[PDB]
Design a protein around this ligand. Structure first.
Ligand SMILES: Nc1ncnc2c1ncn2[C@@H]1O[C@H](COP(=O)(O)OP(=O)(O)O)[C@@H](O)[C@H]1O
Ligand SMILES: Nc1ncnc2c1ncn2[C@@H]1O[C@H](COP(=O)(O)OP(=O)(O)O)[C@@H](O)[C@H]1O
Ligand SMILES: Nc1ncnc2c1ncn2[C@@H]1O[C@H](COP(=O)(O)OP(=O)(O)O)[C@@H](O)[C@H]1O
Ligand SMILES: Nc1ncnc2c1ncn2[C@@H]1O[C@H](COP(=O)(O)OP(=O)(O)O)[C@@H](O)[C@H]1O
Ligand code: BEF
Ligand code: BEF
Ligand code: BEF
Ligand SMILES: [Mg+2]
Ligand SMILES: [Mg+2]
Ligand SMILES: [Mg+2]
Lengths: 41, 528, 96, 517, 528, 98
């Protein structure tokens, strides 16, 4: 078709946030449950 | 050894990285897949500016250091090599696959076991297509010419060339017919000089039934054009690889001159010797001379007076096309002339160009020679240099159609037939291979969806329609309304992709996946 | 229908991460326990679950694996709300 | 030569550009933070770990560093608008900037003197601003109707922010919280207290007023039919202002006397107070161990440290008066309420007073799942409390959702019919820029803005002057019919505060930066 | 000494440099002379942004190192000091003069002899104006008010304020009448608080017949406004410079306390002592207290119960205006109260401001006090800060009109009358002073011409018209159509510049010239 | 169609900017002059042009201001190509210059 373009695109900022954010709940995943292991900081 | 400056990756991260790196290469070129696609300005570190919707070309130019990308660089490349049209797409499909593969991994699946899953589901799709495809060669002769064209056209819709896609298409169709035979089915691209120069618009891009080359025509006084020389069989021309200069050894020299005796004989030796050649060619009975190497001031003038237009210095591939174009023989010495080894061309003119002091020349033939010269023109370099690669793209899809008259209707539908068929076999799979098959087919869906995204259609929407319609009726070919027009059905719409290529593509991606996945260990060092 | 269904569908699909990572940490076969638990959930109900002890799927209420109802309430309540104030971010300018 | 060492000059063409670009640039930063379908921008200061997400225009602009005069001018205009009305912070920059954009057009490619572009604008503004007043209906009278009016303002002034979700909810809170004062336009009377945990929809306005700081050493954990003496007086070593009073004795015993002597002054003052007959004594100041012990043993509850604002709040819910002179009970309005019970807000001690004498001071408790959500819901609310707080001091109202400005457009686009030559163009441009507001509004939502606004302008063109943009069906419905009212002071402020921006800038024909140190 | 890092200039170059440097400073501000003028954004090295058509202000802000410019910086400044309106123009005229002077120099004229030429031709113009000028004070009373205004207005046309120039003008007219007397003709600007705050537009800039100050009103419970206290003569208010705290020495302390005896007496000393003051003011019979220094918690509360609104801490100039505004006396100790030294103001209210938690207060009076407070408001800082200096400009032209009711019609015509008269005397001069007089008058012509240039009129054109018309009729006042309207004649048009200023201006430039020209040697060093 | 039209109108618009820029340099109120020109060529004539001296709009064929057809045809062409090749760009990549 031929209608509204969205010249703008910081679409990427969202996926970027999600990925740079999901990487957090990653380091954690390992410590869930009676088989979860502790972290040493 | 060299312990420092050496990093290591392995799964937790690693796989994410790679998968993401692919995905990202993709995100750039996805906006270039479609007849609504867009090009990308790439700049050489030297400063060379290019502009092109061609997949391979883009990813080759992106000077990039990520190892996985380096791989997709070749993925689009290899495909360009084997077919000539996949490029932009092969990577898309590949990435989608990876994202998909990864997704499963965080659910407890083995990377290598997903691999085998994909390879399998793939082989299936290849088949479900190899069965639904249609044939052209074996159906008609005037319709073969048409279908063969209706592909070249579809193959150009995603290029700046699109503007005048009628001509550029019928040009590519022709250019190939004229240098490959229905039996050998071999298109040797050395028999097709893809030469382009600036000027006019891309519209003034014609096809030459001979060759071009750049020459001032030896002596200025010489004529500009060349008639078939009264009632003769067209024009005859000399095709010699011997210099119009006094013959010399090839081992030593030192022609010792004891006295005025011999120097007196050399004197008159070179003198009439120039007549020994100028005569020689006249004898074979030719109109114009095309010599590989230059002539002397004397020898040139003679070629003038004797109405023998000349062509000083003509490269290998050059001289050679002038032969095959005009049906002649490449004559060594001078005495090896003869009216029967000449070139039976149909005309020769010195072509003018705006006010450009260059002003090359041309050699026509009227009847389809065994050499074509797609001579591309444009308002500016980039338009040309792109339009040439755009022409090339089509010329390739025309070659693939003789090497395999099989055709599949693209518009995304070709990829929907797989996704549909492959997903069916998923339910029967169950267990682990179920996730793989679902995945493979699922990645595929991104191809049409992306087309919808670029043509302005809701992805999930066009997909459900394309899937339903291509099921509620027959696992046929119902594509995306990429441009509009009535409705789907690439057939009516005349959207066609050569099968042979499509297979290659839907393989090259799964295979490339199958490699990356097997990588669970990485070790990079620096540049000491 | 349409939009709303796909959204919901994924959200439902999301929650399965808790059992998947649970099962994964146990070295158990996620995909196995997932499904074995989905089906066993088709008949049984809010009791059929994974238990590192039993190393498979059994009743997690009779296995005394009790979890305060509030915990899971303000778990999804919070997470689900969080994403919203994240999905709302449409740009980021550094500003000091 | 002249000048020197890094000073930079921008003449005509250059200056004008610097300016235009700046403003246009600023505007194009906050265009997304408008419209009910608008988005938030995340930012982070010198601490890095000090992020924040927001849809408040003025917020973003206030933070974002800039070197460009013309931009700072716009930033600053935002803080102003943010002051005298608490809202429109975005709508103003945008309309301000778009007017400049519309001007460099009349200059760079039409060749019109900026002064003549001002000439036109100044007129267009008159007409525009006018049509507003000339179309703004109010409900000052009929207090039971203006409640419905006022609640709509919050209803819509809250869309676009996170609260747009449970907007209906905060709608009431705001309304009620303002009415519970009905007077003082000073919002420092409403205390907002936030704490993580659970949905925003769990936020509430304790009509009984909550307070932080627990009372006494271990006093009654709940008062009954409280009679409180709200006071602010020195409660750790007196002698108020006689400074210089030394205690020279000739023996430790004469010290021991004077020592218990001081500790007597406390039992004295503490007594003069007990004579006030109260079951609760709140002091702005503190109250050390001993002066407290007194109370713990008299039953009078000692709730110390509530600064200045912390008392004024209590002195408006309970109805007492500050006081610091207990030189005589009575003649001192003593405050009262039904209960002064200690409650717990997610891991925290608080004092839920109840049934106070018409609380002209309230507490709103905000509840979000992350500090970000709170801090934004914080102002996202303030953007409501501020308008309403003003509309009680300006009952006039007008319909937004495009409508308002679109009306001012048809006004200017009309008065551009009687005009000179060039000037007219600036005039037409004004209405044009104004029209860019509903456009940018619809844009963010995702419709073919061009097409939608042209439909809108068409109704408002051909009568109606009520239609607006339903940014959901993407149609153009009746705003008065949809409760999308907006403060008249607000819109009138935008159309004004912006025009000023424009004029001050169009008038620039040079910029000079000095040698920064 | 210090031979290095030390340069020298002298004539060949030198004079060019200086002359050009002037000229260039000029070229910037010429675009700001006129009611069609434009402002200039200046930025402090700290970051402070200002925007202003004011001459002096601009050239002060241009952090500039050229010595000659440094001089024109003060030239515009000094004039601002003496009049308050010249600024933008005084420099223009000065530069023009210099260019002119220079021009002659390259024709063999002595720099110092041109100087004397200019000083002379100048003195003449000053006279030809001092004769053609008109008088206002001695003519009428209602017309004085009008003319005095018709100047303030003309004086504002080149400012952002222009928008609402009706109000800003009648405001400046008033503000001065109310603090200077027809006999002394002295406007002390300490009697006019030029305070401005943000909000609304520049339109909401009113004039206050009292003062403002920022105060929360001591105790919160206190009332917000203050009535004239039933049938009384307006409101009475305490104006004391003594702190509401127990009196203390001013030499030492050490109030030695031997035993519980005296400590028992101090105890009750401070206690009722606070009543000793709270009573004291009640006795003088006042409504509200305005104390220079703060009060104690106790003393404050008492002021509450006793319905005595208070004003803790009020600056010098502050407290002082509250006196002169309300006709009161600045009372030292407490016992020095009395119903006859109070302030007979007409009202007091705590002014609200948008939602700004500041919220200052005000003290009105109804009848024109001996103190005015032009309270300026605007949509943004710069508009205000400019509008305040814009207000100031007019206020000054109103002061100059009482100090010399003489008026000349500007619009450039005032400068044309000189150029005309001075040029006449040129023909009689002949020889060297002929070139000077021609020059002086010629530089002058740049003033009106520049107005034409900015209002869009051909310079040479408007000049010939302005000259012819102001000769073919009478050496009167025919100005430039700076804005349009019917035609010239600043009189009808109501364009007026105070004479007293114009003289100063047309002097300050010639004199400054007279200095620069005498400089034939320069020696600059660096910053070791 | 709908949107397309707009680009079309824009074309003629840009084209019109040529006489504008032409008149601009001369020093006339270009906006005003070109609008006069376009008005004649609008309402028939197709011969009037800009006398960049009286600042009026006189007849060009009447004033010997002919131009090669190849020339103008070239401009209107060579430019449109420029446009298309650029509008089609949705990314730019500079490599590590050496
Ligand atoms: N006996 C168990 N068998 C299987 N799951 C259990 C058992 N006991 C507790 N768990 C799981 O352990 C999970 C994670 O706990 P933990 O790692 O401590 O993180 P948190 O408790 O903070 O979620 C709980 O959600 C619960 O489902
Ligand atoms: N005219 C069209 N209508 C529908 N589909 C088309 C059309 N033109 C090309 N396509 C789709 O786009 C694909 C080509 O994408 P393109 O952008 O040309 O990159 P590449 O061809 O290099 O992969 C075709 O194979 C087909 O799937
Ligand atoms: N429900 C709605 N439907 C259409 N317009 C609305 C709606 N709610 C508020 N608006 C419009 O939102 C605009 C204000 O956007 P906002 O992001 O709140 O900026 P500001 O900072 O100016 O308040 C106003 O023009 C108002 O008319
Ligand atoms: N309204 C006007 N019409 C004609 N001349 C005016 C008008 N307004 C000001 N002028 C001229 O411009 C001069 C003032 O210039 P301005 O730009 O105000 O700088 P300054 O007043 O600081 O020199 C007046 O003295 C007069 O010569
Ligand atoms: F875009 Be492809 F190379 F046809
Ligand atoms: F962004 Be605004 F203040 F609603
Ligand atoms: F421009 Be001036 F200072 F009046
Ligand atoms: Mg292709
Ligand atoms: Mg708002
Ligand atoms: Mg002035």
């Amino acid at each position: 078709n031929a209608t509204f373009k969205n010249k703008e695109k910081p679409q990427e900022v969202r996926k970027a946030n999600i990925i740079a954010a999901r990487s957090v709940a990653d380091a954690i995943r390992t410590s869930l449950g009676p088989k979860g292991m502790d972290k040493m900081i | 050894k060299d312990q420092g400056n050496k990093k290591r990756q392995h799964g937790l991260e690693a796989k994410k990285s790679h998968i993401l790196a692919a995905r990202s290469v993709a995100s750039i070129i996805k906006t270039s897949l479609g007849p609504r696609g867009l090009d990308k300005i790439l700049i050489s570190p030297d400063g060379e500016i290019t502009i092109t919707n061609d997949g391979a070309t883009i990813l080759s130019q992106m000077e990039l250091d990520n190892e996985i990308a380096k791989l997709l660089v070749q993925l689009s490349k290899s495909q360009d090599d084997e077919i000539g049209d996949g490029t932009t797409g092969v990577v898309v499909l590949a990435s989608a696959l990876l994202d998909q593969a990864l997704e499963l991994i965080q659910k407890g699946i083995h990377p290598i076991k997903i691999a085998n899953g994909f390879d399998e589901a793939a082989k299936l799709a290849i088949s479900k297509l190899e069965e639904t495809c249609d044939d052209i060669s074996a159906s008609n002769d005037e319709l073969f010419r048409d279908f063969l064209l209706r592909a070249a056209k579809t193959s150009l819709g995603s290029k700046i060339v699109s503007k005048d896609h009628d001509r550029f298409a019928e040009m590519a169709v022709e250019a190939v017919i004229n240098v490959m035979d229905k039996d050998r089915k071999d298109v040797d691209f050395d028999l097709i000089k893809m030469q382009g120069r600036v000027g006019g618009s891309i519209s003034d891009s014609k096809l030459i039934n001979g060759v071009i080359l750049d020459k001032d025509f030896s002596h200025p006084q010489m004529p500009k054009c060349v008639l078939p020389k009264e009632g003769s069989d067209g024009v005859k021309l000399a095709i010699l690889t011997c210099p119009f200069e006094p013959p010399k050894p090839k081992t030593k020299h030192k022609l010792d001159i004891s006295s005025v005796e011999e120097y007196q004989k050399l004197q008159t030796y070179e003198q009439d010797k120039f007549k020994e050649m100028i005569d020689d060619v006249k004898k074979a009975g030719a109109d114009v001379v095309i010599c590989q190497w230059g002539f002397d001031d004397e020898a040139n003038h003679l070629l003038l007076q004797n109405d023998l237009p000349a062509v000083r210095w003509v490269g290998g591939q050059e001289l050679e096309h002038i032969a095959i174009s005009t049906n002649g023989r490449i004559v060594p010495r001078f005495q090896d002339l003869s009216k029967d080894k000449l070139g039976t061309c149909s005309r020769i003119y010195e072509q003018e160009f705006g006010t450009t002091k260059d002003r090359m020349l041309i050699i026509e033939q009227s009847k389809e020679t065994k050499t074509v010269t797609c001579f591309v023109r444009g308002s500016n370099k980039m338009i040309v240099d792109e339009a040439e690669r755009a022409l090339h793209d089509s010329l390739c899809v025309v070659r693939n159609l003789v090497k395999d008259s099989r055709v599949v209707y693209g518009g995304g539908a070709a990829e929907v037939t797989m996704s549909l068929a492959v997903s069916e076999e998923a339910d029967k799979q169950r267990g682990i291979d179920q996730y793989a098959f679902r995945g493979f087919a699922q990645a595929l869906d991104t191809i049409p969806m992306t087309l919808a995204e670029n043509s302005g259609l809701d992805p999930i929407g066009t997909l459900s329609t394309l899937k339903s319609k291509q099921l509620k009726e027959k696992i046929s070919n119902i594509g995306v309304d990429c441009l509009g027009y009535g409705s789907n059905d690439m057939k009516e719409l005349f959207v066609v992709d050569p099968f042979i290529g499509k297979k290659q593509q839907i393989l090259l991606a799964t295979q490339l996946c199958r490699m990356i996945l097997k990588i669970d260990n990485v070790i990079i060092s620096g540049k000491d | 229908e349409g939009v709303q269904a796909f959204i919901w569908q994924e959200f439902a699909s999301a929650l399965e991460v808790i059992p998947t990572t649970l099962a994964e940490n146990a070295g158990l076969n996620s995909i196995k326990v997932v499904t074995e638990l989905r089906s066993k959930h088709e008949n049984g109900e809010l009791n059929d679950g994974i238990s590192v002890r039993r190393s498979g799927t059994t009743n997690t209420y009779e296995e005394h694996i009790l979890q305060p109802v509030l915990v899971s309430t303000s778990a999804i309540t919070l997470a689900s709300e969080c994403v919203k104030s994240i999905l709302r971010i449409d740009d980021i300018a550094f500003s000091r | 030569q002249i000048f020197g060492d890094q000073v930079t000059e921008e003449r005509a063409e250059n200056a004008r550009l610097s300016a235009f670009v700046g403003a246009i640039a600023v505007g194009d930063l906050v265009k997304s933070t408008l419209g009910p379908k608008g988005m938030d921008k995340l930012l982070q200061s010198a601490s890095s770990n000090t992020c924040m997400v927001t849809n408040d225009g003025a917020t973003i602009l206030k933070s974002i560093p800039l070197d460009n005069p013309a931009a700072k001018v716009l930033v600053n205009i935002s803080k102003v608008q943010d002051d005298e009305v608490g809202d429109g912070t975005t709508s103003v920059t945008v309309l301000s900037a778009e007017l400049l954009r519309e001007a460099e057009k009349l200059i760079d490619q039409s060749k019109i003197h900026p002064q003549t572009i001002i000439e036109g604008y100044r007129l267009a503004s008159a007409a525009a601003l006018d049509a507003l007043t000339k179309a703004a209906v109010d409900n000052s009278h009929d207090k039971t109707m203006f409640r419905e009016d006022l609640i709509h303002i919050a209803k819509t002034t809250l869309s676009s922010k996170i609260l747009s979700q449970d907007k209906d909810h905060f709608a009431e809170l705001a309304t009620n919280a303002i009415l519970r004062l009905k007077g003082s336009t000073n919002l420092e009377h409403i205390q907002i207290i936030k704490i993580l945990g659970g949905k925003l929809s769990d936020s509430f306005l304790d009509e009984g007023f909550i307070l932080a700081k627990k009372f006494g050493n271990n006093q009654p954990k709940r008062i009954e039919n409280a009679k409180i003496l709200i006071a602010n007086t020195t409660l750790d070593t007196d002698k108020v202002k006689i400074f210089g009073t030394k205690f020279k004795v000739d023996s430790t015993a004469k010290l021991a006397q004077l020592e218990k002597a001081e500790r007597e002054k406390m039992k004295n003052k503490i007594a003069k107070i007990s004579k006030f007959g109260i079951n609760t004594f709140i002091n702005r100041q503190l109250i050390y161990d001993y002066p407290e012990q007194l109370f713990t043993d008299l039953g009078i509850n000692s709730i110390e440290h509530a600064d200045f604002e912390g008392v004024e709040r209590l002195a408006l819910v309970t109805g007492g008066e500050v006081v610091s002179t207990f030189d005589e009970p009575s003649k001192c309005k003593l405050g009262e309420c039904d209960v002064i019970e200690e409650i717990m807000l997610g891991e925290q001690p608080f004092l839920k007073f109840s049934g106070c004498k018409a609380g002209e001071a309230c507490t709103i408790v905000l509840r979000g799942a992350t500090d970000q959500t709170l801090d934004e819901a914080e102002r996202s609310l303030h953007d409501a409390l501020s308008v309403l707080s003003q509309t009680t001091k300006e009952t006039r109202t007008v319909l937004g959702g495009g409508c308002a400005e679109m009306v001012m457009s048809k006004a200017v686009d009309t008065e551009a019919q009687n005009i000179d030559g060039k000037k007219s163009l600036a005039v037409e441009a004004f209405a044009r820029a104004l029209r860019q507001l509903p456009t940018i509004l619809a844009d963010n939502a995702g419709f073919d803005s061009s097409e939608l606004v042209s439909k809108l302008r068409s109704s408002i063109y051909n009568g109606i002057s009520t239609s607006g943009l339903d940014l959901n069906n993407g149609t153009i419905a009746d705003m008065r019919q949809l409760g999308i009212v907006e403060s008249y002071k607000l819109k009138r402020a935008v159309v004004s505060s912006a025009s000023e921006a424009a004029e001050v800038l169009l008038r620039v024909d040079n910029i000079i930066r000095a040698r920064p140190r």
